[PDB]
Ligand SMILES: CCCCCC/C=C\CCCCCCCC(=O)OC[C@H](COP(=O)(O)OCCN)OC(=O)CCCCCCC/C=C\CCCCCCCC
Ligand SMILES: CCCCCC/C=C\CCCCCCCC(=O)OC[C@H](COP(=O)(O)OCCN)OC(=O)CCCCCCC/C=C\CCCCCCCC
């Protein structure tokens with residue numbers, strides 16, 4: 162347990178010695194294009210170190226609060242870079258991304274995915290599943306893990322299913338304002354919504370039930386029994402300390418209902434601007450930046466979701482929202498503003514009439530539900 | 542007291558609305574040289590806002606913890622910029638400072654100040670004080686305020702006087718390794734050390750005694766009596782909540798003595814690298830950057846000095862040093878490394894023999910004092 166309360170002046174000394182050595186004893190190259198990137202990277206690294214060693218501890222502790230402090234600092238850095246990218250012109254921002262990786266900044270080609278439907282197709286005699294084969298890509302294994310983590314983040318069945326359904330309706334309405342969207346109805350539902358609910362959401366709820374019926378008693382690593390107990394402790398150190406499963410009961414007040422609606426809206430906007438950011442900044446879907454963003458968003462979303470539940474469930478008259486939820490909301494707003502700024506012509510396309518009627522019907526149905534809620538509250 | 546517990550989501554909404562307006566509804570200029578500076582400034586402003594609204598509260602509260610959070614964030618930004626400047630070449634760093642202000646990046650002329658001594662000089666019959674007149678500049682009014690604040694920061698007589706004396710000896714030894722240093726012996730002592738001890742240090746100790754014999758009882762701004770009480774409360778709101786005067790007793794152990802020596806060394810290095818930074822980065826002494834650095838260092842030094850006293854005086858087995866002291870130490874180390882890197886040829890000049898003998902005598906005297914301390918501890 163030495164590392165769990167280790168000193169910070171030792172970290173300061175190590176950092177100072179390392180940077181002093183690498184700056185003085187080495188030879189500085191005579192080109193500014195490399196030294197500028199080196200300085201930016203060094204500043205980012207030092208900020209990460211200082212935050213890891215001196216930031217606040219979040220609600221999550223295991224495996225080490227330094228992990229969540231590191232992710233908080235990464236969130237801060239990402240927000241700063243997002244704002245810097247926002248405040249420039251579009252082509253200069255794309256060239257800045259080209260500075261990040263020397264392959265971006267060029268118009269990538271566009272292709273359609275849902276061009277082939279009717280799985281039982283006699284077009285290709287050799288393979289009946291010729292239409293399915295192209296669909297069976299890394300997306301399907303990604304959906305299971307993604308929704309497993311996203312249902313570990315929010316810890317509710319109804320909220321999770323409503324978020325998934327709302328996002329799928331939004332994706333269908335999003336098809337003509339972003340041409341890469343092309344999915345058949347079977348691929349839309351059976352391949353995505355069916356798979357998520359059947360496997361990812363179900364496994365997340367099973368994990369919550371399994372690890373919410375456990376006794377959390379821990380002791381030292383050297384007081385445990387022989388190698389069997391050693392391996393048991395090593396494996397279980399990455400299991401959570403103790404959680405409180407969230408219970409979002411929205412039909413009890415008005416502010417609580419609006420707060421649940423707001424967090425649902427933020428969750429939807431996260432995925433919306435994820436897709437629109439991978440589109441408008443001219444980054445390929447398989448670029449490592451997108452995967453890094455996904456991992457960071459998974460971790461930061463879990464922490465911020467716990468923090469916003471803690472803020473929402475408090476009985477005290479005035480509580481300040483945790484910094485992680487604030488940072489996630491700021492990042493989402495900045496990403497949405499970037500998306501609106503960079504490509505407004507493609508985003509401003511008018512909705513299809515036949516789906517706009519359905520959207521209006523849903524809106525009026527929600528309004529009727531709200532007024533009926535008010536009526537029943539008045540009666541009671 | 543509305544602002545003392547006001548909401549943070551309101552701040553987030555205001556920031557998001559203002560940045561979205563200034564980015565979208567305005568027209569982005571078609572030059573990257575202005576947009577890059579605009580983006581950097583916007584990122585700095587957003588980081589300042591987020592830190593002010595969501596950082597940790599330091600030991601100092603009055604007039605508002607937001608003030609000290611703002612100074613902590615400024616410290617973070619200054620450290621990051623210092624490291625970025627460090628990791629480049631010397632000429633590129635000077636041109637970066639030229640980017641900060643379009644007049645820097647040029648070799649400024651060098652002049653001597655202590656070229657005229659012997660105040661009672663019959664060289665100029667018209668004015669006997671012709672030598673004094675050039676000396677009587679803004680430096681003397683600056684010394685009083687500077688040492689008043691610096692003795693409010695450390696809250697001790699002996700430590701303050703020893704720091705002043707050590708810094709003056711260091712300045713005298715620093716004359717040939719930095720040519721701008723030129724002061725006559727009277728200007729060295731009577732004009733600086735005499736004035737500080739007579740006025741600044743004495744007024745600081747008088748203020749500490751006066752405001753350490755006060756009863757700190759406060760109430761609301763609307764429960765006070767009429768306009769007399771209103772003005773009294775308005776004036777006294779900027780008076781401190783309640784302080785605990787530090788008492789540095791170094792002759793009790795060895796770790797405590799070494800800690801006092803370390804904080805004295807950091808205090809000396811702060812002024813050393815202040816002068817060497819204003820010299821080596823080609824900034825004129827009267828540039829606003831130097832004054833901003835002085836103000837920031839005054840505030841951050843006070844906060845970090847309280848934090849390091851709190852860390853040093855704790856009885857608990859393990860306490861983490863406050864972030865402000867960590868940041869001040871990091872900034873001092875980074876500034877010293879920049880000074881060593883940029884102009885090593887001027888700094889590496891061999892010290893004068895006649896003063897090197899005095900320095901060796903002082904060092905051996907300190908060693909004898911330490912061994913006598915060990916001898917007396919062994920006897921007792
Ligand atoms: C921290 C708690 C959650 C995680 C628990 C364990 C933490 C460590 C696990 C790390 C494992 C890395 C996972 C690798 C990434 C991965 O598997 O895929 C990422 C998956 C797969 O991508 P998909 O979008 O599903 O596929 C697109 C199909 N067209 O992506 C995702 O998970 C998306 C996550 C979105 C997160 C949204 C964040 C917003 C959450 C809350 C904010 C809401 C409200 C709070 C804010 C403000 C309140 C006022
Ligand atoms: C916060 C507590 C202290 C201030 C109290 C009130 C705060 C608000 C007051 C703001 C007023 C602004 C003052 C304007 C600036 C001013 O008057 O002059 C600045 C003066 C005048 O300049 P001089 O160097 O004296 O003249 C040169 C002569 N050759 O400059 C200074 O005050 C120098 C201050 C140096 C401070 C050093 C900081 C380091 C302190 C502690 C760190 C040490 C240990 C902790 C770190 C690590 C521990 C392991």
Ligand SMILES: [Ca+2]
Nearest residue numbers: 332344349353
């Ligand atoms: Ca889909």
Ligand SMILES: [Ca+2]
Nearest residue numbers: 712724729733
């Ligand atoms: Ca002097």
